[PDB]
């Protein structure tokens, strides 16, 4: 499912970063990077959700986890 983040998607994310030539080994490394980031944020989101005794994850859990990690996000209620 992490393979579902396709090569053209990483190419587009690189184009938005101004990258003109992309090595053929970039994509696996970027997949690892994204997996680590998501694992770090989702863990705190689920921690908040479990503390609230809820079975659902809300946008505010994600926003609080991101603010905790140092990646404050604007436009989702926090």
């Amino acid at each position: 499912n992490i393979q579902g983040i396709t090569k053209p998607a990483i190419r587009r994310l690189a184009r938005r970063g101004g990258v003109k030539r992309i090595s053929g080994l970039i994509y696996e490394e970027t997949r690892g990077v994204l997996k680590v980031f998501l694992e770090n944020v989702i863990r705190d989101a689920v921690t908040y959700t479990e503390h609230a005794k809820r079975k659902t994850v809300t946008a505010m859990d994600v926003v609080y986890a991101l603010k905790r990690q140092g990646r404050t996000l604007y436009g989702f209620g926090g």
Binding site: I26, E29, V57
Partner: protein
């Protein structure tokens, strides 16, 4: 037959995707990935659509900034091609 010399379409894509504001990862694959990742921490979870949207936006911003730092690292080595070692250097100097 018309062929553009390798390097022109890359700049055209750079301009196009730096002009836009949309998301660049497909919605359904990212939702599937988020659900599978969260499957480890908890069983039988439920995700508000806004939770997945916030996660996707945070991930996209993080990856874009990381790629910009990687491009700086690559240009530093007198290159034009970004490489895994430049990603690793950008991540190490950042502290991550």
């Amino acid at each position: 037959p018309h062929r553009y010399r390798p390097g022109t379409v890359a700049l055209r894509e750079i301009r196009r995707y730096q002009k836009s504001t949309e998301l660049l990862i497909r919605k359904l694959p990212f939702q599937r990935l988020v659900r599978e990742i969260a499957q480890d921490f908890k069983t039988d979870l439920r995700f508000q659509s806004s939770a997945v949207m916030a996660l996707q936006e945070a991930s996209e911003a993080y990856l874009v900034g990381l790629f910009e730092d990687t491009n700086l690292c690559a240009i530093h080595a007198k290159r034009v091609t970004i490489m895994p070692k430049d990603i690793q250097l950008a991540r190490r100097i950042r502290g991550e």
